[PDB]
Design a protein around this ligand. Structure first.
Ligand SMILES: CC(=O)N[C@H]1[C@@H](O[C@H]2[C@H](O)[C@@H](O)[C@H](O[C@H]3[C@H](O)[C@@H](NS(=O)(=O)O)[C@@H](O[C@H]4[C@H](O)[C@@H](O)[C@H](O[C@H]5[C@H](O)[C@@H](NS(=O)(=O)O)[C@@H](O[C@H]6[C@H](O)[C@@H](O)[C@H](Oc7ccc([N+](=O)[O-])cc7)O[C@@H]6C(=O)O)O[C@@H]5CO)O[C@H]4C(=O)O)O[C@@H]3CO)O[C@@H]2C(=O)O)O[C@H](CO)[C@@H](O[C@@H]2O[C@H](C(=O)O)[C@@H](O)[C@H](O)[C@H]2O)[C@@H]1O
Ligand SMILES: CC(=O)N[C@H]1[C@@H](O[C@H]2[C@H](O)[C@@H](O)[C@H](O[C@H]3[C@H](O)[C@@H](NS(=O)(=O)O)[C@@H](O[C@H]4[C@H](O)[C@@H](O)[C@H](O[C@H]5[C@H](O)[C@@H](NS(=O)(=O)O)[C@@H](O[C@H]6[C@H](O)[C@@H](O)[C@H](Oc7ccc([N+](=O)[O-])cc7)O[C@@H]6C(=O)O)O[C@@H]5CO)O[C@H]4C(=O)O)O[C@@H]3CO)O[C@@H]2C(=O)O)O[C@H](CO)[C@@H](O[C@@H]2O[C@H](C(=O)O)[C@@H](O)[C@H](O)[C@H]2O)[C@@H]1O
Ligand code: A3P
Ligand code: A3P
Ligand code: A3P
Ligand SMILES: OC[C@H]1O[C@H](O[C@H]2[C@H](O)[C@@H](O)[C@@H](O)O[C@@H]2CO)[C@H](O)[C@@H](O)[C@@H]1O
Ligand SMILES: OC[C@H]1O[C@H](O[C@H]2[C@H](O)[C@@H](O)[C@@H](O)O[C@@H]2CO)[C@H](O)[C@@H](O)[C@@H]1O
Lengths: 654, 287, 655
C-alpha cells in the first residue's frame, strides 16, 4: 500500500516539519521523487496501530526510546551507512540507535528538558524546587504564576521524580528491576502533588495551556525542550534557558531523548530514504534548514554541532542532558511510559494516592508473564525437523528465548512414569529456561494429568508415511549431509528399499510405517499396539485438542509463516530467515532411491498403511483449513489476514 | 478476598433465545458486579484465524479490568487448553431443535424481528415460504443448512465444518461433556436459568426472578413465521444431515435433563434446588 | 548427563575453592579420578535448577539450611558413614544435617557472623548498636565511616532483627508460626533503616562495596564471617574479630550456618564422592589445605578443631554462634530467606515502610510452593481400597500431608451440579489441607469445566468385574473383619451367589456388573445408561487422559511401588509399609463362596459383562505397560529405572 517512487515522512507535531519539508523540495527538484511531510496526532504509540489497516510512511521521526519496540516487531529496516558516514556523527548517538547489535535509525539531534524563565518577571531563577511555593506567593498577589508546564505527559514530570533517586531499569545489560516506587520516586512525585494541593499549579495543565501562559507572560517559569524556543521568539518575551532546579539538593535528572529517523521495513523506497537522510538531511544544509523552523537542540552531526555549541541556550540543554540519562531503547519503554503516565495523572487529580499510584505503576512496567511460555516440538524423525529446529536456534538469541534438546536412552520415544513426572516438573518449573523451546523425538506427553498450572504449547510437522519410511530407510544406510561423520546404525547394508520390500525384509515391513500415529497417541499402551483402530482415533483427537499447530513437511514454508504470525515471540523473522538462509534444507539423506510404482503399490495394500495415511491426510486437511482461514491470496504470495473481530456492547459503562 | 477471577463464555447459537438470556446477564451485571462484552466477527464468520484465536484467548484471560466477565457472540467453540493458559474460561450454551431453529432463522432473514425492527435483514424481499422452498429444493432450506449446532461445539477444526461428518458429531458430543459447564435447551430455558443461579450465583443471582417477572424474557421474536407442514418436516427428516444434527440435540437434551434431575426436588408445585449432600469425615492428622 | 569416572564439585564463591582444588589434585593423583572444583554464581538457586534435570555436580557445598528442600525434592543421596567416622565429628553438627531421620550431608565447618573492627581507626569497639550514630559523627568529619556491610543479603541483617525478639519458626520440632513482624523484629529493622535515613550508611551497600571499604581502611567496622579474614590479611590493615554489638541491651542473635557437603542423587560416582569426603577432605590434611585459602571457622572434625580453637578470632566466632541459633534445615527456609530479603531491601530503599514490609514478609514465609498438590482417589467398592487408603493414613503424618474422606448421602456416586461446584471449590481453595489426599466412593469429576488453576491428580484401583461383584455380594450378607460391628444392609439373606444367579436374582443380575465403567465415565447421563457403548469409550478416554495411574487389585503391590517412585511426597515408604505392616490385607469379606465354573460362564454371556471386562483388560494392559517401562527385572524382584533423558544443545549460552 506504500506508493513506490515517492517518500512519505512522519515527524512529531511540535518539531520543525515545515523546515524538513524544505529539504523535501530540494530532494524532489534533484531526483524527481515527491516528498510529503506530515505530522499525525499521537504517533508515540499509534504508529503500528492504524497501520494494521493501511501501510503508510517510509521514514519515521521520533526519540530513540520507541525504536526498539518497532525493531523487535520488525517494523524497521536495518540501515547501512558506510564508516565514512558514521565518523561524521557522534559515536554515542549511534549507540542510542543500536538495538540487538545493528543500527536501526539515523540519529538526528539530542534533546533534553531545560528550565525556561521570564527575564523580566524573574531576573534570578530559583536554584532549588523548594523555593517555588514561596516564590508563587508574591507572584499570585500580582496576578502571575511561578511555574506552568505539561503535567499530562510523564516526560516533563520525570526530572523531578528521578531527582532524589527514582529510576527505570538499572543499567548493569538492563534488567527487570524497576524503581518507580522507591524513596526518590515517591519523594519527588509527592512534592509535585503538594504543588497542586497548595494551588501553586493546576492539575489539568497540558502543553497548549503551558505554552500560552508563558508566551503571553502570565507565568514566570516553564519546563520544555529546544523545540519550544521558536514560539517564544514570536512573543517578544525576554526569556532565558537555564539548568533545571534541584530537589532535595539533588540535580534534576531529565530523560534524554535522541531524535532519530528510521526506515519502514515495508517501504519499497529504502534506497531513496537512505539517500535522503544521508545526503540531504544529515548535512549542514539540511539540519540548518530545519533548525530555522524549530530548534533541534544538539545535533548528532559533528560539523553543524560545532557551530550550535556556541549558543547560550544549547549550553544549558547539554548541561541538563549530562545531569540526566539517555533513555534505553528496550521494548519495555513503551509499557514504562504508559505506566508512569497513569501514575502521574492519577496522583495529580487526587484519584489515587502517591504511595499507591507508584506501587501500581511499579508492576505495570515489566514482568507481565509474557515470558512464561513453553513450546514443545516432539519432532518426528526424517520430517525436515532439523531444518525447522535450526530456525529456533538462530532466532532464540535475538528473540530472547531458550532452546533445549531432549535426549532419550536408545532413542526410545516412551518415558517411564517417573521420568514423565520429572520432565513435566522441569518444563514447567525451570524458570531460567522460559520462554523455552524443548524439542526431541519423544511421544506426545499429556501435562494435564500431572496437575500443572500452565500447559506447554505443542507443535509438530509430519510427512507422508511411505516417503518418510523410505527417507528413514536410506538414512540408516548412508547417513546425511548435516553430520556426515557419524556412522549410522545399519550402515553396510547394500539392499535397496524396493529390493527389500519385494524380499519381505524387516526394515521395510508395513509394521514399520506405524510411527506417526503413536507419536501423537502418546505414552498409552494401545498407541503402540500396531494397527490399533483406537490408537488412530486417539492420535487424531490429540492433534486437534492439544497441538497448537501441526504442519506437513512438504509445505513447511507455510507452516513457518503461520507460526510467525501466531507465536511471534518465538518466530519473528523466521520466514525471512527460511527464504534467504541457505540453512533451510538441512540433513538431506545422502543416497536415496525413490520407490517403484510397484513397490509403493504393495505397501498400500497394508491396513497399517491405510491407517497411517488416513491420519496424515487428516492432519493435512486440517493444516490446509487453518492456513485457508489465516491468509489471503492476493496475486502471488499469501498475506496474513488482519484482525477480524472486536468487542462491543460492553456494559456497565464508565 | 473475593473470587473475582472468573470468565464465562457463552458462544451463542443463532435463533435459540440467546438474546433473551444474554439480556439477563446485562441486567444483572451492574448489580452483581461483573462485566458483559459482545464478540463481533467479520461477516459473522464463526471461525477465527489462528492469529485471532491467540489474540482472543490472550484478551479473555489477561484483560484484568473485565473480570469477572461474560463474553458472548456467535463464535464456534474455542479450546483454551491448547494455548497454555493458567485458568480456562467457563463455557455455557443453549441449543434448539435443529428444524425449528432453521425455520426460525429462515423467516428471520425474510422479515426480521421485534427487538430491533429497524434493521433491514439480508434476504428481505424474498416471498417464498419455508415449506414452498423445501418442496422446490431451495438453497436456504436445504438439509445442509441444518448443519450448524454441531460445528459450533465441534470447534475450529476442519472436520467440524465438513457437513455430515460422523467424526464431527462425535467430537461435538465430547466437547459438550468435557468442556461445557452447562448446555440447556431453548424450550426449557427457565430451568437452565434456575440451575445457573444455583451453580454460578455470582453471575446469576436473581436471574430466575428477573426472568419470571421481567417482560424482557421473550426477546427477538421473528415477526412473521409460518410453522412447517407435517409433509415438510417429514422430508427434512429423511436427510442424514438431519438425523445427525438431531442425534446431537437429543444427546445434549438428555444430558440437561439428567443434570436437572440430580440438582432439584419436585415438591408439590415448584422445583426446589437440592441442599448439600456431601461432607468430609475421618480427616487426619488431627489438632 | 553427569559424567561417570570423575568428580565435579560446586562450592560458594567467597569460600576457599582453590584450597579444595588442592585436595582434588591429591585425590586424582591417588585414584586417577579427575576432580573439578567450580564456583557458580547464585549457587544456592542454581543447584536445584540443574539437579532437577538430572545434571549438576556430584558434590554440593552450602550451609545446611538449604539441604532440607534439596532432600525433599529428592536431589540428595542418603549418606552412610560408619559409626567409626561419626565419632570423629561433633554430634551436634550431625544433627544440623539430619533431615527426616537420615543424614543427607557431611558437615564441614560451623560459620557465624562476628564484628570486625579496625584496630588503628578504632582501638575500643562499641559494645552496643546505639552508640554508632554518635560514633559515625566524628569519623565522618575525618572522612571515614562507622560501619559498612552487606545490606543486600538478609544473612547480615538478621542479627540485628533477631536481637530484640525476632524469630523464624518457633522450636517446639519446628512450628510454622513465623515471627518476623513482632516487637523485636520491627524494632531491630527500624533502627537499621534509621541508620540509612541519618546517612550513617548507604542502602546500596553490597558485599564488594563493604569489603573494599574496609580493606582500604575507609570504614572502622564491618560485619562478616571467617571466610573474609584471608582478604584483610592481604591489606596489612590491623583488625580484630570481636562479639557482635547489643541492640536494646540484647545480644545480637546471628543465624549460625554449618557448611555441608551433600551428594547429588543423580551422580553415578556416589562411591567416589563418599571416599573423597570421608578420606581426603574430612581429615586434618584436607581441612588445613582449604583453611589456608579461606578460613572455615570452627570445623566439625574433632581432631582439627582442637587446634583451631586456640585462635583469638575463632573464639569470637563460637561466641556469637552460641548467642545466635543454628538454622533449621526445613524446606520452608528457602521461602523464608526470600521473604526477608524482600522486606529488608524494600524497607532500606524507602520502597516500603518497616511496619508494612515485615507484615508482607510475615505471610510469605509460609509459602505453600511445592506443597500445592492434591490427589483424588475416587475409590471403587471392594477393590482393596481400604488397605491402600490406610497406607495414606499411616504416612500422612510423617510425610506431612492431609487425608480426608468424602461422604455422600446414601453413598450415591453422582454429585448435584451445585455440590460439584462446592467440592471443586473446596479441593482447590482449601489451603490448610494441602497437600491433600481426598478419597471416597464418588464418580469421576472433571475439574477442567469449572475453570480451576490447577487440576488434582486422579488415581484409582479396579478389580475383575465378576470377582468384585461376588466380593460385594457376600459383603452385604456377612460383613467384613475391619469393622465387624456394623450390621450390613442385606444381612439376613441366606441365598448364595451361585444359587442367586441360577434363580435370576436381583443382586447378581448382569446389570449389577456395571459400576467400574460409570465411575470413570463420570457425572454424565450416558455413563449411567447401563450397557452404553458410548459410556465405555468415554470411560477409557478418561482413564488415559485424566488418571495419573490406575492399578488393579490383584497387583496392588506394584501399583504402590510405582506411586512411591512417581509421587514420593505422598508415598515415600509406602512399599516398605505394605510388605511389613500386617495392615496390608484389610476388610476381608468374612464368609465368601467362590463362583462355580457354571455360574461364571452364564455371567459372561451378558453384553454388560463383555463391556465391563473389556474396560478392565484395557486398564490392566495399560498398567502392565506403565510398569514395564518404569522398572527393570534383575533376578526375581523389580527395581525402578534411573533417569533416561537429559537436555543438550541449550542455547543461548552464558560464559
Ligand atoms: C558437550 C560439548 O561441549 N559439546 C560441544 C559440541 O556440541 C554438540 C554436542 O556434543 C552434540 O551432541 C550435539 O548433537 C546434537 C545435534 O546437534 C542435534 N541436531 S538438531 O538440533 O538439528 O536436531 C541433534 O541431532 C540428532 C537428530 O536430531 C536426531 O534425529 C538423531 O537421531 C538419530 C540417531 O542419530 C540415529 N542413531 S545412529 O544410527 O546410531 O546414527 C538413529 O537412532 C537410533 C539410535 O541411535 C539407537 O540408539 C537405536 O538403537 C536401537 C537398538 C535396538 C533396537 N531394537 O531392538 O528394536 C532399536 C534401536 O536405534 C535408533 C534407530 O535405528 O532409529 O536415528 C535417529 C533418528 O531417528 O540424533 C542426532 C543426530 O544428528 O544424529 O542432537 C544431537 C545430540 O543427540 O551437537 C552439539 C552442537 O552444539 O553442535 O560442539 C559444539 C560446537 O558446535 C559445542 O558448542 C559450543 O560450546 C562452547 C562452550 O564451551 O560454551 C561455546 O562457546 C560455543 O559457542 C558453542 O558452539 C559444544 O560445547
Ligand atoms: C458504535 C455505537 O454507535 N455505539 C453506541 C450504540 O451501541 C450499540 C451498538 O452500536 C450496536 O452495534 C449494538 O448492537 C448489538 C446488539 O445490541 C446486540 N444485541 S444482544 O446483546 O441482545 O445480542 C447484538 O445483536 C446481534 C444479534 O445478537 C445477532 O444475532 C445478530 O446477527 C444477525 C445479523 O444481524 C444478520 N445480519 S443481516 O442479515 O444483515 O441483518 C445475520 O448475519 C448475517 C451477517 O450479518 C451477514 O454479514 C452475513 O453475510 C453473508 C453473505 C454471504 C454468505 N454466503 O454466501 O454463505 C454468508 C453470509 O450473513 C449472516 C447470516 O445470514 O447468518 O444474522 C445474524 C443472526 O444469525 O446481530 C445483531 C443484531 O441484533 O442484528 O449485537 C449487536 C451488534 O452486532 O448495540 C449497542 C447498544 O448498546 O444498544 O448505541 C448505544 C446507545 O443505545 C451507545 O451506548 C452509549 O454509549 C455512550 C458512550 O460511552 O459514548 C454512553 O455515554 C451511553 O451511556 C451509552 O448508552 C453506543 O455508544
Ligand atoms: N525445507 C524442507 N522441505 C521439505 N523437506 C526437507 C526440508 N529440509 C529437510 N528436508 C528433508 O527432511 C529430511 C530430514 O529430516 P529430519 O531433519 O527430521 O531428520 C530429509 O529428507 P530426505 O531423506 O528425502 O533427503 C531432508 O531432505
Ligand atoms: N424465553 C424463551 N423461550 C423459548 N423461545 C424464546 C424465548 N425468548 C426468545 N425465544 C425465541 O428465540 C428466537 C430468538 O433467538 P435469538 O434471541 O438467539 O436470536 C425467537 O424465536 P422465533 O423465531 O421462533 O420467534 C424467539 O421467539
Ligand atoms: N493387598 C490386597 N491384595 C488383593 N486383595 C485385597 C488386598 N487387601 C484387601 N483385599 C480385598 O479387597 C476387598 C476389600 O475391598 P475394599 O477394601 O475396597 O472394601 C476384600 O476382598 P474379598 O471380598 O475377596 O475378601 C479384600 O480381601
Ligand atoms: O511523555 C511520554 C513520552 O515521552 C517522550 O516523548 C517526548 C519526546 O521525546 C519529545 O521529542 C517531545 O515530542 O515530547 C514528547 C513528550 O510530549 C518519549 O520520547 C516517548 O516515548 C513517551 O511516550
Ligand atoms: O542471605 C540469604 C542467605 O543467607 C545464608 O547464606 C550465607 C551463607 O550461609 C554463608 O556461607 C555465606 O555464603 O554468606 C551467605 C549470604 O551471603 C543462608 O545460608 C542462605 O540459605 C540464604 O539464602
Amino acid at each position: 500500500k506504500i506508493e513506490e517512487g515517492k517518500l512519505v515522512i512522519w515527524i512529531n507535531g511540535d518539531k520543525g516539519y515545515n523546515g524538513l519539508a524544505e529539504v523535501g523540495k530540494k530532494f524532489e527538484k534533484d531526483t524527481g521523487i515527491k516528498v510529503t511531510v506530515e505530522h499525525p496526532d499521537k504517533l508515540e504509540e499509534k504508529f503500528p496501530q492504524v497501520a494494521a489497516t493501511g501501510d503508510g510512511p517510509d521514514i519515521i521521526f521520533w526519540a530513540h526510546d520507541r525504536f526498539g519496540g518497532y525493531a523487535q516487531s520488525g517494523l524497521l529496516a536495518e540501515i547501512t551507512p558506510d564508516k565514512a558516514f558514521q565518523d561524521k556523527l557522534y559515536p554515542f548517538t549511534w549507540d542510542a540507535v543500536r538495538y540487538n547489535g545493528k543500527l536501526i535509525a539515523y540519529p538526528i539531534a539530542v534533546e533534553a528538558l531545560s528550565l525556561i524563565y521570564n527575564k523580566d518577571l524573574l531576573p534570578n531563577p530559583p536554584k532549588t524546587w523548594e523555593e517555588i511555593p514561596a516564590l508563587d506567593k508574591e507572584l499570585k498577589a500580582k496576578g502571575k504564576s511561578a511555574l506552568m508546564f505539561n503535567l499530562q505527559e510523564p516526560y516533563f514530570t520525570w526530572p523531578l521524580i528521578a531527582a532524589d533517586g527514582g529510576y527505570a531499569f538499572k543499567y548493569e545489560y538492563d534488567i527487570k528491576d524497576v524503581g518507580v516506587d522507591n524513596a526518590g520516586a515517591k519523594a519527588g512525585l509527592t512534592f509535585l502533588v503538594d504543588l497542586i494541593k497548595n494551588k501553586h499549579m493546576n492539575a489539568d495543565t497540558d502543553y497548549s495551556i503551558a505554552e500560552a501562559a508563558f508566551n503571553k507572560g502570565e507565568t514566570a517559569m516553564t519546563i520544555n525542550g529546544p523545540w519550544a524556543w521558536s514560539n517564544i521568539d514570536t512573543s517578544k518575551v525576554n526569556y532565558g534557558v537555564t539548568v533545571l532546579p534541584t530537589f532535595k539538593g539533588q540535580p534534576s535528572k531529565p530523560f534524554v531523548g535522541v531524535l532519530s529517523a528510521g526506515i519502514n521495513a515495508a517501504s519499497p523506497n529504502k534506497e531513496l530514504a537512505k539517500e535522503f537522510l544521508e545526503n540531504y538531511l544529515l548535512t549542514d544544509e539540511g539540519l540548518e534548514a530545519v533548525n530555522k523552523d524549530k530548534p533541534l537542540g544538539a545535533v548528532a552531526l559533528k560539523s553543524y554541532e560545532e557551530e550550535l555549541a556556541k549558543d547560550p541556550r544549547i549550553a544549558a540543554t547539554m548541561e541538563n542532558a549530562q545531569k540526566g540519562e539517555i533513555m534505553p531503547n528496550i521494548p519495555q519503554m513503551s509499557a514504562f511510559w504508559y505506566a508512569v503516565r497513569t501514575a502521574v495523572i492519577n496522583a495529580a487529580s487526587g484519584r489515587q494516592t502517591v504511595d499507591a499510584a507508584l506501587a501500581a505503576a511499579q508492576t505495570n512496567a515489566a514482568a507481565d508473564e509474557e515470558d512464561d511460555v513453553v513450546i514443545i516440538y516432539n519432532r518426528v524423525p526424517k520430517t525436515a525437523s532439523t531444518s525447522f529446529t535450526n530456525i529456533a536456534y538462530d532466532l532464540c538469541a535475538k528473540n530472547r528465548y531458550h532452546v533445549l534438546h531432549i535426549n532419550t536412552t536408545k532413542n526410545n520415544p516412551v518415558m517411564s512414569l517417573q521420568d514423565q513426572v520429572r520432565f513435566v516438573k522441569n518444563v514447567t518449573s525451570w524458570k531460567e529456561m522460559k520462554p523455552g523451546f524443548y524439542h526431541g523425538h519423544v511421544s506426545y506427553l499429556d501435562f494435564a494429568k500431572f496437575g500443572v498450572k500452565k500447559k506447554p504449547i505443542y507443535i509438530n510437522v509430519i510427512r507422508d508415511p511411505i516417503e518418510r519410511l523410505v527417507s528413514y530407510y536410506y538414512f540408516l544406510r548412508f547417513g546425511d549431509d548435516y553430520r556426515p561423520g557419524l556412522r549410522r546404525r545399519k550402515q553396510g547394508d547394500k539392499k535397496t528399499f524396493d529390493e527389500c520390500v519385494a524380499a519381505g525384509g524387516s526394515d521395510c515391513a508395513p509394521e514399520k510405517l506405524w510411527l506417526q500415529i503413536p507419536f501423537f497417541c502418546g505414552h498409552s499402551s494401545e498407541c503402540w499396539n500396531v494397527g490399533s483402530r483406537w490408537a488412530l482415533e486417539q492420535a487424531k483427537y490429540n492433534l486437534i485438542n492439544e497441538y497448537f499447530l501441526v504442519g506437513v513437511t512438504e509445505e513447511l514454508e507455510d507452516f513457518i509463516m503461520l507460526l510467525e504470525a501466531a507465536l511471534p515471540r518465538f518466530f519473528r523473522g523466521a520466514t525471512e530467515l527460511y527464504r534467504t538462509g541457505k540453512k533451510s534444507h538441512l540433513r538431506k539423506t545422502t543416497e536415496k532411491k525413490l520407490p517403484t510404482k510397484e513397490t509403493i503399490a504393495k505397501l498400500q495394500q497394508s491396513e497399517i498403511w491405510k491407517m497411517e495415511n488416513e491420519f496424515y491426510e487428516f492432519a493435512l486437511e486440517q493444516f490446509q483449513f487453518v492456513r485457508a482461514h489465516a491468509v489471503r491470496e492476493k496475486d502471488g504470495e499469501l498475506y496474513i489476514l488482519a484482525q477480524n473481530f472486536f468487542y462491543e456492547k460492553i456494559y456497565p459503562k464508565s
